[PDB]
């Protein structure tokens, strides 16, 4: 997808002139560059394809941070985590999607598991993940029967294995994910995306049995939206995030220092 060439534009003046408009119409202003420059013809021939949605959305980024410690004293209980799936707590990805009313995409999901040693060695280690759609029984324990997964998407990683990935199709009960919402679940709390965006949760858990090595596991989890579509653009976030689902921005004991920077006088660039 390309710009047109630009023609040569003859130096002229006339009673006809498009340089004037009514921006108040809502329509964008007097469109044409050849109107006020006596141009030479140029093969303006620079592709917009990097500017495509399947480009701009369609680069991966990190989403969330599954940090865990391997507890010893009840290894069997504690050594798992669960995270509520959202695009709302890493700013760059958030701001890609905080750009529209709604968006739809299939998802590359990519896992960057990392083991950090608090001990002289780590040995072999294996780690489980599960997508927990809502109303799956959430694992309560590193020994919970819920680690069995006859139909839940559960996947494994271990020391020395390559980065896991999967393709997750577009999920919503609706046509597109709400980037924002203007009301409630029907009895009137959780205003906005905390209503609509119940994807349930990701989960993780050490699969190797009790062993002597005190370790931290950290998974950085990444995603890229592809086969994307998006719906009615909306203005970018001006200030630091605060509250995942909620658009809150007035932070506690703080002030609204936006991306705009002041200057001494408006006659000085």
């Amino acid at each position: 997808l390309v710009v047109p060439n630009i023609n040569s534009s003859n130096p002229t003046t006339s009673n006809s002139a498009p340089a004037l408009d009514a921006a108040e119409t809502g329509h964008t202003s007097s469109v044409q560059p050849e109107d006020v420059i006596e141009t030479r013809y140029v093969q303006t021939s620079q592709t917009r394809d990097e500017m495509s949605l399947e480009s701009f959305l369609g680069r991966s980024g990190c989403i969330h941070e599954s940090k865990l410690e391997v507890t010893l004293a009840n290894y069997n209980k504690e050594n798992f985590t669960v995270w509520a799936i959202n695009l709302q707590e890493m700013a760059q990805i958030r701001r890609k999607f905080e750009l529209f009313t709604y968006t739809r995409f299939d998802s590359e999901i990519t896992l960057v598991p990392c083991i950090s040693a608090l001990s002289q060695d780590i040995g072999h280690i294996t780690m489980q993940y599960m997508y927990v759609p809502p109303g799956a029984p959430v694992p309560n324990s590193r020994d919970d029967y819920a680690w069995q997964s006859g139909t839940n998407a559960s996947v494994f990683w271990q020391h020395g294995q390559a980065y896991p990935r999967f393709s997750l199709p577009f999920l919503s009960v609706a046509s597109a994910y709400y980037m924002f919402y203007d009301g409630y679940d029907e009895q009137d709390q959780n205003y906005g995306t905390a209503n609509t965006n119940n994807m349930g949760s990701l989960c993780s858990r050490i699969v190797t049995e009790k062993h002597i090595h005190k370790v931290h596991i950290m998974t950085r989890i990444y995603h890229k939206a592809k086969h994307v579509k998006a719906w009615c653009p909306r203005p970018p976030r001006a200030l630091e995030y605060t509250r995942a689902h909620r658009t809150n921005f007035k932070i506690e004991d703080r002030s609204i220092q936006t991306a705009i920077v002041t200057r001494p006088i408006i006659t000085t660039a």
Binding site: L1, F170, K226, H227
Partner: peptide, 25 residues
């Protein structure tokens, strides 16, 4: 068939179509 912007043939092979995650313009 070959790639329209290009000079070679390549096409899907993974099973279910949504899982591809790579689109034309």
């Amino acid at each position: 068939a070959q790639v329209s912007r290009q000079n070679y043939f390549n096409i899907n092979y993974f099973k279910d179509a949504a899982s591809n995650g790579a689109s034309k313009l």
